[PDB]
Structure formats: structure tokens, C-alpha cells
Design a protein around this ligand. Structure first.
Ligand code: K
Ligand code: K
Ligand code: K
Ligand code: K
Ligand code: K
Ligand code: K
Ligand code: K
Ligand code: K
Ligand code: K
Ligand code: K
Ligand code: K
Ligand code: MG
Ligand code: MG
Length: 1335
RNA sequence: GGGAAUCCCUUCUGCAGCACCGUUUUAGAGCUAGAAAUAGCAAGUUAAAAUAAGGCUAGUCCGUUAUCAACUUGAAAAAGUG
DNA sequence: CAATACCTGGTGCTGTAAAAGTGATTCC
DNA sequence: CCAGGTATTG
């Protein structure tokens, strides 16, 4: 008995099928367990497992980190209250107690209900004097009087609890506050560098212009307009643009060779400026640094909108300015509405349901919704011009706690906190003693490289302590080992050397590593001249001279420099042919030039005695990112460099690690030669062996020592191994389910292993609109275009492909240097850069928007050479703006290098057929290592089971060429059918061409391969089309003579298999996990559905949650008290155990159920019912458990194959010859009556199992309404109709314009007397429990 | 076919640190005419506390990912059953 | 108890290594 | 999104 298995691995399904020698699917009698009449059942060995998507860890992590931040914020407040404890007890022994219970109702409060002062007169007086906390904050900063300790605490606590971001290092307001003074100093520096061309900045109000609430470009234009004879693209204009945050290009300003775009926000600016300063001189550095200072001032003026010389609390002053203008404008608006529109006053100022001022303050209306609601009202009335200006500036009737307050740095809150402490420490000695303590409470951050401050009970922590004691913000440096913690943070993420698994890899920017990379590449360079007989390698002396003369003097070494600066200058060659490198060398000594600029001692870098020191420096600059820790580690070399050099070394940092260790590169030595790997790379006679040759040479000891160095740790389990793979967790869930399906199928076949296992993995193509808008915004900003000014776009609109391409191309044609019209996109074309006939790629990375695809050139290749000559520079602009990627740019410019060759097209077709994805190889490896476990006489693996991997295109083309069409919406059988067709096609393919095993089975001329792989699947066809020819009906193997395909009997077999109505569709039952309930904190309500947010917070007084998630239902057979007499009555019902209740219920099910009300619980009759638990009722009607009180549809509609194929062809689902198109069209019109037959089949099914009378009546009326509609559109909407009958949760669907709402099964009473069905993973093994025999 | 280093890119995964809102109950004395529903007006911007119930291991830690038919034997781990 | 219509926490930033999709140089 | 919970109206 021989058989094969076909598998279709998906993100929500695993289709499976068993086939025999004749491509038939067996059928078996399987035993049925339980308490029903049926002892066994007939099963076809084909089916599909269904399961909810496996989720990533991201949402769990985000909630975990947020939980920590809430705990630590509370701890900050606890620290501050602990500092205030004694003196506050002297002042008010219950102040902190009243704060703690502020949330409680007056009934539940143990102290007076007014928090601050404990009586109503003082509380009202306080609010009258300080209507916002910012009034109190500014008063405490400015005043010299002794203040109430409670108000001091409230100000300090408010600053500490909401302390602001930490994006800026160091201290703030260092005379970089004034915009006028820094603009004047920028003019001073510019006029100093350009005496002949000075700027008259007199009368220019730099403060109001630059700090205006306007866009960056508008303010740039406004300032430049105040400077006659200066243009915005000039040098001073570009400096102002850099200060405003734009991306100016200083290339044209200095007649520079290539671009020097500068952005003060980019990570590369520190280098991007120095690089520019290397070309035009270091006397322009003062100018760019003055512009940077101006940028800091403008950023601060965005937040502080008040003069900083009248108060030391400019933030609180700005909030008070918000409050005062809110008050003034509200009084004016009330008066205006009273006078002009008196009927609208109640709706605006009293209706919380409306988005007026009432909904803005009391309702759920946001500032944006309030502005949208009141803008037409202000436009309708008179005297609203200033209010309208404030509205369109987003600065009308503002609150103080708003969404944009994220701009506020923590240094500003710190400045006010420090000022209050300086004020009040003169009266309270404990404030003087604890001033720095409180400041540390606000400023302290747990470093990202330290992680949770755990003590052996967090699987996420890595921190190590210097002493065993509680960590506080004040003892962190003493208790926490920051060096070891940060080193562990990196070393727990980095790989070891795979050749020497106990050795750490080098820093990627290490000098030794870059030497290795350069010599490895350079050792395979060859050159020829005239008198030479053949190309020769470079000798050790030649490579040493090239390194010293070229690589150590240029950051990049081009081939031109190699031919001219070495072969001409040294070897006196006028002509030389180079191989092994193209255009320029890939490897380079970048760190060497970085350190050469920093330390300015070439002899220090070239001295080998300093190698260790330099390696350690680069390690310190790579291993750490905190500048203080870098300085602490570079301390040990302070004697070797000037303090200026030490500071410049501090500022330099690197990221990333190499893939080889120092011991491998320059440590281990060959036994007989005594030379390291790097020694052989520098000089290896005339062989010039590279790294791969060195470690694989049997005449050297490198290979032997690498073999000896290998180890193998603890073997992962199957689940662990699958989890460690690289890929989406969703596909990993399918992979593990696939392995369990294979194990059960093998057990079904009597532990006999299959001949083949054919796997096919679905292409994984699956907020995102936010990423699209971020790309377009940054690309347009880098580009300097005003396309977003002229054409504003909502992020959602970018989901349209043509509009997204339009913005990515800056509103221009990609093939013609013309503007596109945004209202003409329907008339334009989306073109594939490489044609879809070669590369089936429909992503934005292979698509462009053009007026007409004809303008690309010839359709058989890439864009023509003419188009590339026209558009290459515009493409490079788009590439630098990241509006197109590097691969997209290279595919566009491919015509420069010869376009598509015949080898490229052959490779494209091979890629379309042969699967090369790494995750699919890992799945094949897993199955192969589980099936094949024995070795032969030569100690080589015996491959009893061939693991074949196919791409989806093979079976897809097989279905479309032999009319085995699929329609996904009909049912779930197509997953199983795909697995079957995979097994058939895969086995037949390797039977016909056994030499293909290397390509398709796991384990160890261009026109010819193009033709061969284009016609690889022709052996299935009988007639193949000026090349029309026939094939035998019987296809056999050429050498063995074995039959592989009988075109007269095997197609009928495939058709019979797809026609079988019994297919084992199994929905994976799963306990529900995750959030306890909806997160919405609802208002109080007289409902038992509300859930307390805290133990003592009665939701009838405080509100809370509702809508909890049922982890799993439980069948309870017991008795409950009834009536006022509490008489016991027998019941059988479903109790949903929520996620929150699960732990308590499982700890003691009997006591849990008795608490719920049940008495005398039959403990052994408790049935655990997870979601999707399957029940069968009458006439084969099945239901699945959706929760404790709702059901899902549990049946599949096995629509016959003739109707499925008719629906495919009639609906134009997905062509071929026009004669074949005519035959299919004639078939559709000759079988038009299939529409009524399909509707009748849906009706019989629905009346038998769906039981939705109203929806079925609406559907029948809708079908009988649109019978004069075209056949194609009727078929397309019949496709929609199957939502009524689909397995699973009910959903709404549209038939033409008629909308059918979902009929829900809002009761689980009937399943309590039905038959519960427990299914194995394949559904072949069943246990059926008659629940009517319970109770 | 499988694999390695480098160059130019892109994406996915995992982890850590942090900010701004939102919501919720309470506090911010509403007034006048009414015996009452109600009418006329005044007012509104702020704060406290919670932000999974909670847990023991008591840490400035942990609490939403992964994994799960049934039955037999087991505390579980598991294996076994057609 | 059924049927109907509403509801559903969100945004921004910093740091990090790794596999893997794809183009290229050199090799096992 | 999807699809289970909830109150309102029957
Ligand atoms: K889930
Ligand atoms: K009380
Ligand atoms: K001007
Ligand atoms: K609101
Ligand atoms: K190159
Ligand atoms: K670093
Ligand atoms: K020194
Ligand atoms: K789960
Ligand atoms: K109130
Ligand atoms: K199951
Ligand atoms: K990341
Ligand atoms: Mg908590
Ligand atoms: Mg808030």
C-alpha cells in the first residue's frame, strides 16, 4: 500500500490530501467513539484544518511596557510624597489621604470631600485664584512669599507626573531662547564671511516672522521677502531654511560638484555637515553652527509663546495665555451668538450631543470636531474675523491639556520645578536638603540598555546589580552596573562567530575587519597588459602598495584610480585590463579615514603596536551609545590624545557587527605556515586564496580547527525550532499544524510512510496608509516640492494605487519629463518596469504611473535606452528622496547595462516555477528530518520520503488549463482541493522528469532552459500550440518506461476527486485569550453587566467595563434555587467562563460554580467547550459555539462541480485563444439555466441548515428582481450570495444594491440536547456525545 | 541545487526606554421664578486617582504572544488508544 | 426570548541585531 | 476590519 500526501500551508488553513498510485483519494471506515448509535463512519482522506490567525507579540509588549510606565509614574509620586511626609503631617495630617480617595463618592470618603484644603470656602477661594494648575505653577515660580506646603506639593507633583519627553540631551534655554538675537548673530556671521555681499537686516521682525504659526516654507518666503536682492535659494535663504527644519541643498551655493543636502533632524547631519565642511573649508562651520542655534530658538518659540523676561515660567505663562484668550473669545462668541443667532445659543452651549462648545467641553467632541462644527457659524456671522483666523491657525478656545503638548521637553518642566524649589527652600529646610532629590525624581530615566529592574523573576530582564538593595532614582549609578547591563543588552542580541561558536564577532567598523574585507576582495583582482601572456593576480607587495597608496588615501577606490594612480604611476602601464572588480571597490577603509580625521596621526594608525588599542576604541564606540559611558571607557587612553581629540572621539559612534571573530581573522594560524587568515589574504604566493578557499583547503589546518571548534547545544523541540524560524507567527502556526496533520495522516495509514510529500506555501501578502503618508511627506520634503501644498491628500486616499504612484512620482510621468494631471488618473496607465510576463510582481516596487505605457519603448524588455537617457536624473532624484527604492531604480536603469538578457528571462521563468523562499525550505527540512531517519552503508541519509515543494503557479495554471476552476467564496473545500492537486502535479512532475529532483526535492543554452521551463508542464496537454503539435494520450518515463499520466483516465480521476461532497473541513477549537474585556471605561449604570475596575469600586457608583471575553464555555448539570422559596430546580445550561474568571474557576470548579448559584453540580458531567465547539442537530444541521450565548454556522455547502465551473466562467473570475473564449462563452449561454439551479441549491441548503427565513426571502426576491441583468453580473452577485451559507460567523452581504443583514444565532439552548462532536486534527477520528442523555 | 564574506537597498521579527491624549468617579458653593415637571440666565478651559480584576516571588517585578479534540493511565510531564 | 442597531482605546518618539527579499563582486 | 456584547424594543 503506497501513497503520497499533498499539503497547502496557509495563514488560516492547512489543506491536506492522501493520494494513491492512480492519483485517487482513498476512503476508510473510522471508528466513532462516544454514546450514540453510530459506531463508525466513512471518511474520504482529504480535508482542511481551519484556524484563527496567529498573532504577533507586539500588542502584548506594548501593554507590558505601558504597565511598567504606569507603575513607575505612581512610584515617582510616591517618592515625592515620602519626601513631604513629616512636614505635611505638621500642616495637614490628612492631605495625602484626601488625594488618595479623591475618586470615591462622598458616601465612601473617610475624610472631607474637598481635597486641597478640606473645607468649601478655602477650596472655592483656591479655584478662584488659580483656575488652572498653571496659574499656581507660575505664581510659585515668580513669587517671593512663603507658600502653603500643599500648593507647593501640587505644583511639584503635576510637573513630575507629566514631565515631558526626553528627545533633547543636555540642558536648555542656554541663551538660545531669543529668535531675534540668534537671527542677528547669523547675519553677523554671514556678513563676516561675505563683506562684498552683505545683508541689510534692519527693520526685519525676525521674531514674529520665524515664530509665526505657519508652515516652514511660508515663513521662509516671508523672511526672504523682507530681504531685497536675496532669494530663498541663496545661501542665507538656505541657512534660514535649515533653521526652519527644511532640507536645503547647499550644492549650488558653493558651486559644489555634487549635492550637499542638509537636514538638522537626520541622524547623518553630524557627518553631513563635516563632509560639506571638508570641501569648502572650516571657516564656514561658524555659519552653520549659528544656523543650528537659530533652529533651537525657533523650536522653543513653538512651545513658549510669551516673553521670557517677564517670568521664569514661560510654559505656564503660555498655558495661562491659552486660558485668558479662551475666556475672552468665549465671552465675545457668546455675545455674538446672543445678538445675531439667538436661536442657536442652546444648541451651541447646552447640547453635549452636538459638536458645539457644550460637546467640546462636556461631550466627546474634540478640538478638531469643534472647529469643524463652528467654522460655518463664524463665517455666517459678523465680527468673527479674528476668531476665524485663530480657528484656521488651530489656536481658538484652546484647552491646556491637549494632544500637541507632546512637543514639551522635560527640561522646561524641570526649569519651573527648579525655580519653585529655589523659591520655597528659603522657608522649608527639607526642600533645600531634598532639592536635588526631587529634581532627580523628574529627570531620572531607566536607560533602554538596562531594562526592567528585576530580581530573578522577569523573563525580560538582563540587568545586573553592583549591590543587593532596592534601586531608587538617587542610587541608580551605585546599585546598577550600567556597563555590564549595557554589554549584556547587546551581547544577548548578537550572533557568535559561526565558524568559532565560542568567539564574539568583531565590530562591523573595526579596523581589522575592514582590512580583512579589503584584502579579501583585492586578492581576487586580476590584470592583463600587452606583453603579458595571461592575467595575473596581484602579488603581496602589489596589494600592500595599493592599500598604502589608494585605500589609505581615499575613502573609496575606483577602478580608474587603480589603473592611473597605481598601474600607470608605479608600473608605468598606459593600458591595463582589470577583472574581479567593477567601477569601484566594494570594501573600503572607512574607519581608518574617520580616525585619521579625528586624531590626525597617520603613523599612529599605521603602527601595529597600537592595533589592540584602536580595536578597543572601536569596540567601545560600537558596544555603547551613552556618551558618558563611552567617555568613561575611553578614559584609559586619555594620555595618548589631546583633550580636543578625546572630545571628538566621544562624539563618534558606530552601529552594527561583523560576521567573523578576531580569532578567525587574525588569531588562529596554519600549523606549517604559521600564518593567520589575514596573513594569507595579504600574501599567498601566486594562488591568492580568499577566505572561502582558505577555510576549505585540506592542505591547511584552518578547516581542521574550524571542525574541532564546532559544538551543538541542547536540541530544540519541534515547537521551539518552529518558533525560532524567521517569519511571521501566522505562517509558523500553519507550519506546526502542518506537521501535526502529517503525523496523524501517517498514523491513519498504519504507520506507513508516504512515497512523497508535496508542500505548497501561499504567498504571504497579509496604519499601512500611515506608512504611505509618512513616505510621501518625507520624500516631498526632501525633494523640496510643493505638491502637498497644491494637492492636500488624506492618508486613506493613498490606498488607491494610481494616486499613491502619482504622489510617489511628484505628479510626473516616470517615462516622459512631463507633469501628470491628478484628475486624469483614470486615463493613465500603471506599467510594470520588468514585464509581468517575466516577473509576476504587482507591488509598487515594480510599477510606475505613466500617461501611456507605449512611451516605455518595447514591451518585450525593460524601459528602452531612450527613456533611460531622458529620465535617469529624475529617477535619481526620486531615489534620493526614497520615493523609489534602489532595486526599483536599478530595474529602471537596466537598459544601460544591456537590458534583459536571455539568461535573465530563463531565470525569471525558473523562479516562477521553482520555489526558493527560505521559510519553505525550512518546512521541507522539518518534514524531511522527521520522515527520513536511517543511513545506508556509506553513512548517508536514506531518503524514503521525497519532500517536494511547488509554487502556487503550477497548480493554478493546471486548474485554468484543464478547467478545474476554484471559487473561494463557495466553501472551504478549495484548500483541500489545492492540497490534492499539489500532490498529483508534484508526483507526476517528478515521475516524468526524475532529473528535476535536484530542483524540487529537498536534500543534496539560455534559450534552451527558457524553452524547457516554459514547456515543462506541456506533458499534461494533448495538443500544444506556428508551433501546433500533438502528444501521446499516455505519457511515460523515458528510461524506466513507467506510465506517469493517462490523459484518458487520470483527468477523470481528478474530476471525480473534486466532485466528492464529503470533505473533512475542521475548524480548530481554541480557548480564547487576551484582554479581559473591552477597554472602554463606561459611565455608571444600573446593570449587572458592568465590571468593577477596582475591588471596592461598585460599578453602579463608579462605572467600569462590560463585554468580557469568554475563554471557554462549561456545560453545567446541577440545580439552582427558584423563587422566594429557594426551591431546588434541575437545570442544564452553558456558563461562559470569562478570561478573568478562568484561573479562579480552574483552581476549584465546584466552589466557583456554587458561588455562581449552582447546587449539587455533577462534577463528572462538566464539559469544557472552547470556541468553535461543533454540535450536530436534526437533518445534519450543525452549529459551532461562538460564545456562551451565540452560535455560528457549522455546515459546508458542497456545490456540485458543474455549478462551480459555470460560476467561474460566467463571472469572468480570471484567458486563452479567442476560439476557446468563444466556446466558454457558448457554454455559459447554453447553460444559463444553471443560475436558477444554483439559487435552488442555495435555497434547499438554507432551508435545511441556515434557518434564516427573512434573509432567504429577501435574497429570493432580489434574485427574481435582477433576472434581466447581464449573466456576468448576475453570476458575480451569486458569488456574494454564498456569504449566507458560508461556514462560521454570520455576516452581511450585498446582492447588487440590496443589502442583506446577518441573521444571528443568539441562543445556545438547542445545543444542550444535540450531539457534541470532538474531532481530531484531521477530523477523521470523532467522538460523538449525545447531550440529550444528560440531565 | 545548497552555502559564505563584502557592497547598494528593502522588509519582517523580538526586546527595552519614554512622552501626549482619551475615558472614568470626585472636587471646582450655580442663580432667580416656581409647591412641582419647568422657564430665564450665569457657567465651562483645571485637578486628584485608576488605566486590565489583580498575584507572590514583594521586584521601581509579574499579569493580553506562543501552545490546546476526546478518552485511558498520571499531580502534572507525558506516553498510549481507532 | 428573538430581533435590531449601536458599540468596539489612540497618537508620537528613542535605542538594538537579526533573517530575508532582491541586484552586484569574489569564492566553497 | 470582523464579530461578539449590550440595551432597546418588542
Ligand atoms: K487570538
Ligand atoms: K464622608
Ligand atoms: K527677496
Ligand atoms: K470633549
Ligand atoms: K563594485
Ligand atoms: K554604538
Ligand atoms: K592628553
Ligand atoms: K492564544
Ligand atoms: K462639578
Ligand atoms: K480538534
Ligand atoms: K523595530
Ligand atoms: Mg496597577
Ligand atoms: Mg487626562
Amino acid at each position: 500500500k503506497k501513497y503520497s500526501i499533498g499539503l497547502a500551508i496557509g495563514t488560516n488553513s492547512v489543506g491536506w490530501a492522501v493520494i494513491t498510485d492512480e492519483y485517487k483519494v482513498p476512503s476508510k471506515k473510522f471508528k466513532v467513539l462516544g454514546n450514540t448509535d453510530r459506531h463508525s463512519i466513512k471518511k474520504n482522506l482529504i480535508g482542511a484544518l481551519l484556524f484563527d490567525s496567529g498573532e504577533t507579540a507586539e500588542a502584548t509588549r506594548l501593554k507590558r511596557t505601558a504597565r511598567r510606565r504606569y507603575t513607575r509614574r505612581k512610584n515617582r509620586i510616591c517618592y515625592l510624597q515620602e519626601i513631604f511626609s513629616n512636614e505635611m503631617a505638621k500642616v495637614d495630617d490628612s492631605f495625602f489621604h484626601r488625594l488618595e480617595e479623591s475618586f470615591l463618592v462622598e458616601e465612601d470618603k473617610k475624610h472631607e470631600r474637598h481635597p486641597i484644603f478640606g473645607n468649601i470656602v478655602d477650596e472655592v477661594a483656591y479655584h478662584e485664584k488659580y483656575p488652572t494648575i498653571y496659574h499656581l505653577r507660575k505664581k510659585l515660580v515668580d513669587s517671593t512669599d512663603k507658600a502653603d506646603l500643599r500648593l507647593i506639593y501640587l505644583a511639584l507633583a503635576h510637573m513630575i507626573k507629566f514631565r515631558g519627553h526626553f528627545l533633547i540631551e543636555g540642558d536648555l534655554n542656554p541663551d538660545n531662547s531669543d529668535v531675534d538675537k540668534l537671527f542677528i548673530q547669523l547675519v553677523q556671521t554671514y556678513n563676516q564671511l561675505f563683506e562684498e555681499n552683505p545683508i541689510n537686516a534692519s527693520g526685519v521682525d525676525a521674531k514674529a516672522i520665524l515664530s509665526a504659526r505657519l508652515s516652514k516654507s511660508r515663513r521662509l518666503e516671508n523672511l526672504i521677502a523682507q530681504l531685497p536682492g536675496e532669494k530663498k535659494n541663496g545661501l542665507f535663504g538656505n541657512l534660514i531654511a535649515l533653521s526652519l527644519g527644511l532640507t536645503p541643498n547647499f550644492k549650488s551655493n558653493f558651486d559644489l560638484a555634487e549635492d550637499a543636502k542638509l537636514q538638522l533632524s537626520k541622524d547623518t547631519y553630524d557627518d553631513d555637515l563635516d563632509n560639506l565642511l571638508a570641501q569648502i573649508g572650516d571657516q564656514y562651520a561658524d555659519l552653520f553652527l549659528a544656523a543650528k542655534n537659530l533652529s533651537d530658538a525657533i523650536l522653543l518659540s513653538d512651545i513658549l509663546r510669551v516673553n521670557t523676561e517677564i517670568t521664569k515660567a514661560p510654559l505656564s505663562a503660555s498655558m495661562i495665555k491659552r486660558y485668558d484668550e479662551h475666556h475672552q473669545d468665549l465671552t465675545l462668541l457668546k455675545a455674538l451668538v446672543r445678538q445675531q443667532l439667538p436661536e442657536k445659543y442652546k444648541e451651541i452651549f447646552f447640547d453635549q450631543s452636538k459638536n458645539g462648545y457644550a460637546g467640546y467641553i462636556d461631550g466627546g467632541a474634540s478640538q478638531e470636531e469643534f472647529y469643524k462644527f463652528i467654522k460655518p457659524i463664524l463665517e455666517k456671522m459678523d465680527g468673527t474675523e479674528e476668531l476665524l483666523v485663530k480657528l484656521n491657525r488651530e489656536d481658538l478656545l484652546r484647552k491646556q491639556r491637549t494632544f500637541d503638548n507632546g512637543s514639551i521637553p522635560h527640561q522646561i518642566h524641570l526649569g519651573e520645578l527648579h525655580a519653585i524649589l529655589r523659591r520655597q527652600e528659603d522657608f522649608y529646610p527639607f526642600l533645600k536638603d531634598n532639592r536635588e532629590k526631587i529634581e532627580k525624581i523628574l529627570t531620572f530615566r531607566i536607560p533602554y540598555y538596562v531594562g526592567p529592574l528585576a530580581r530573578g523573576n522577569s523573563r525580560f530582564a538582563w540587568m545586573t546589580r553592583k549591590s543587593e538593595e532596592t534601586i531608587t532614582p538617587w542610587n541608580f549609578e551605585e546599585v546598577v552596573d550600567k556597563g555590564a547591563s549595557a554589554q549584556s543588552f547587546i551581547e544577548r542580541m548578537t550572533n557568535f562567530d559561526k565558524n568559532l561558536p565560542n568567539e564574539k564577532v568583531l565590530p562591523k567598523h573595526s579596523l581589522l575587519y575592514e582590512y580583512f574585507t579589503v584584502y579579501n576582495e583585492l586578492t581576487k583582482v586580476k590584470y592583463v597588459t600587452e606583453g603579458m601572456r595571461k592575467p595575473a593576480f596581484l602579488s603581496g607587495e602589489q596589494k600592500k602598495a595599493i592599500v598604502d597608496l589608494l585605500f589609505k588615501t581615499n575613502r573609496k577606490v575606483t577602478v580608474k584610480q587603480l589603473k592611473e594612480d597605481y598601474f600607470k604611476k608605479i608600473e608605468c602601464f598606459d593600458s591595463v585590463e582589470i577583472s574581479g572588480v567593477e567601477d569601484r571597490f566594494n570594501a573600503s577603509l572607512g574607519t581608518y579615514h574617520d580616525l585619521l580625521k579625528i586624531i590626525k596621526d597617520k603613523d599612529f594608525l599605521d603602527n601595529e603596536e597600537n592595533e589592540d588599542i584602536l580595536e578597543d576604541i572601536v569596540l567601545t564606540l560600537t558596544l555603547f551609545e551613552d556618551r558618558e559611558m563611552i567617555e568613561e571607557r575611553l578614559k584609559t587612553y586619555a594620555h595618548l590624545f589631546d583633550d580636543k581629540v578625546m572630545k571628538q572621539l566621544k562624539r563618534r559612534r558606530y552601529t552594527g557587527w561583523g560576521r567573523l571573530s578576531r580569532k578567525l581573522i587574525n588569531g588562529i594560524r596554519d600549523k606549517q605556515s604559521g600564518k593567520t587568515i589575514l596573513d594569507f589574504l595579504k600574501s599567498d604566493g601566486f594562488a591568492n586564496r580568499n577566505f572561502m578557499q582558505l577555510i576549505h583547503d585540506d592542505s591547511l589546518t584552518f578547516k581542521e580547527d574550524i571542525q574541532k571548534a564546532q559544538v551543538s547545544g541542547q536540541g530544540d523541540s519541534l515547537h521551539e525550532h518552529i518558533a525560532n524560524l524567521a517569519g511571521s507567527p501566522a505562517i509558523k502556526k500553519g507550519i506546526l499544524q502542518t506537521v501535526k496533520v502529517v503525523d496523524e495522516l501517517v498514523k491513519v495509514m498504519g504507520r506507513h510512510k508516504p512515497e512523497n510529500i508535496v508542500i505548497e506555501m501561499a504567498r504571504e501578502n497579509q496604519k499601512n496608509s500611515r506608512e504611505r503618508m509618512k513616505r510621501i511627506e518625507e520624500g516631498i520634503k526632501e525633494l523640496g516640492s510643493q505638491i502637498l501644498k497644491e494637492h492636500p491628500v488624506e492618508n486613506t486616499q493613498l490606498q488607491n494605487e494610481k494616486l499613491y504612484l502619482y504622489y510617489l512620482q511628484n505628479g510626473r510621468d516616470m517615462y516622459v519629463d512631463q507633469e501628470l494631471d491628478i484628475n486624469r488618473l483614470s486615463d493613465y496607465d500603471v506599467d510594470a518596469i520588468v514585464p509581468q510576463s517575466f516577473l509576476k510582481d504587482d507591488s509598487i516596487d515594480n510599477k510606475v504611473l505613466t500617461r501611456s505605457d507605449k512611451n516605455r519603448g518595447k514591451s518585450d524588455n525593460v524601459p528602452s535606452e531612450e527613456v533611460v537617457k531622458k529620465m535617469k536624473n529624475y529617477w535619481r532624484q526620486l531615489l534620493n528622496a526614497k520615493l523609489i527604492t534602489q532595486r526599483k531604480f536599478d530595474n529602471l536603469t537596466k537598459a544601460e547595462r544591456g537590458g534583459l538578457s536571455e539568461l535573465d528571462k530563463a531565470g525569471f521563468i525558473k523562479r516562477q516555477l521553482v520555489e526558493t523562499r527560505q521559510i519553505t525550505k525550512h518546512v521541507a527540512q522539518i518534514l524531511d528530518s522527521r520522515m527520513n531517519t536511517k543511513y545506508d552503508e556509506n553513512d548517508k541519509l536514506i531518503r524514503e520520503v521525497k519532500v517536494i515543494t511547488l509554487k502556487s503557479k503550477l497548480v493554478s495554471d493546471f486548474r485554468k488549463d484543464f478547467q478545474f476552476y476554484k471559487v473561494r467564496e463557495i466553501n472551504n473545500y478549495h484548500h483541500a482541493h489545492d492540497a490534492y492537486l499539489n500532490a498529483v502535479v508534484g508526483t507526476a512532475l517528478i515521475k516524468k522528469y526524475p532529473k528535476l529532483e535536484s530542483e524540487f526535492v529537498y536534500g543534496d543554452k539560455a534559450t534552451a532552459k527558457y524553452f524547457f521551463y516554459s514547456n515543462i508542464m506541456n506533458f499534461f496537454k494533448t495538443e500544444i500550440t506556428g508551433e501546433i503539435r500533438k502528444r501521446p494520450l499516455i505519457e511515460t518515463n523515458g528510461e524506466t518506461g513507467e506510465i506517469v499520466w493517462d490523459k484518458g483516465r487520470d483527468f477523470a480521476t481528478v474530476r471525480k476527486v473534486l466532485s466528492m461532497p464529503q470533505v473533512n473541513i475542521v475548524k480548530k477549537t481554541e480557548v480564547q485569550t487576551g484582554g479581559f474585556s473591552k477597554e472602554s471605561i463606561l459611565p455608571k449604570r444600573n446593570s449587572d453587566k458592568l465590571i468593577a475596575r477596582k475591588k471596592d469600586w461598585d460599578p453602579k457608583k463608579y462605572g467600569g467595563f462590560d463585554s468580557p471575553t469568554v475563554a471557554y464555555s462549561v456545560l453545567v448539570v446541577a440545580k439552582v434555587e427558584k423563587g422566594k422559596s429557594k426551591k431546588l430546580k434541575s437545570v442544564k445550561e452553558l456558563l461562559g467562563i470569562t478570561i478573568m474568571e478562568r484561573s479562579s474557576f480552574e483552581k476549584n470548579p465546584i466552589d466557583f460554580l456554587e458561588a455562581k448559584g449552582y447546587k449539587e453540580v455533577k462534577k463528572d458531567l462538566i464539559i469544557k467547550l472552547p470556541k468553535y465547539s461543533l454540535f450536530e442537530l436534526e437533518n445534519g444541521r450543525k452549529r459551532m459555539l461562538a460564545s456562551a450565548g451565540e452560535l455560528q454556522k457549522g455546515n459546508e455547502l458542497a456545490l456540485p462541480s458543474k455549478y462551480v465551473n459555470f460560476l467561474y466562467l460566467a463571472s469572468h473570475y480570471e484567458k486563452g485563444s479567442p476560439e476557446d473564449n468563444e466556446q466558454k462563452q457558448l457554454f455559459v449561454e447554453q447553460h444559463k439555466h444553471y443560475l436558477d439551479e444554483i439559487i435552488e441549491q442555495i435555497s434547499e441548503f438554507s432551508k435545511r441548515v441556515i434557518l434564516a427565513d427573512a434573509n432567504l426571502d429577501k435574497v429570493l426576491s432580489a434574485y427574481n428582481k435582477h433576472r434581466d441583468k447581464p449573466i456576468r453580473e448576475q453570476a458575480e452577485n451569486i458569488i456574494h450570495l454564498f456569504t449566507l451559507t458560508n461556514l462560521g460567523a454570520p455576516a452581511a452581504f450585498k446582492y447588487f444594491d440590496t443589502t442583506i443583514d446577518r441573521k444571528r444565532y443568539t441562543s445556545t439552548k438547542e445545543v444542550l440536547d444535540a450531539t457534541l462532536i470532538h474531532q481530531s486534527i484531521t477530523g477523521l477520528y470523532e467522538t460523538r456525545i449525545d447531550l440529550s442523555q444528560l440531565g
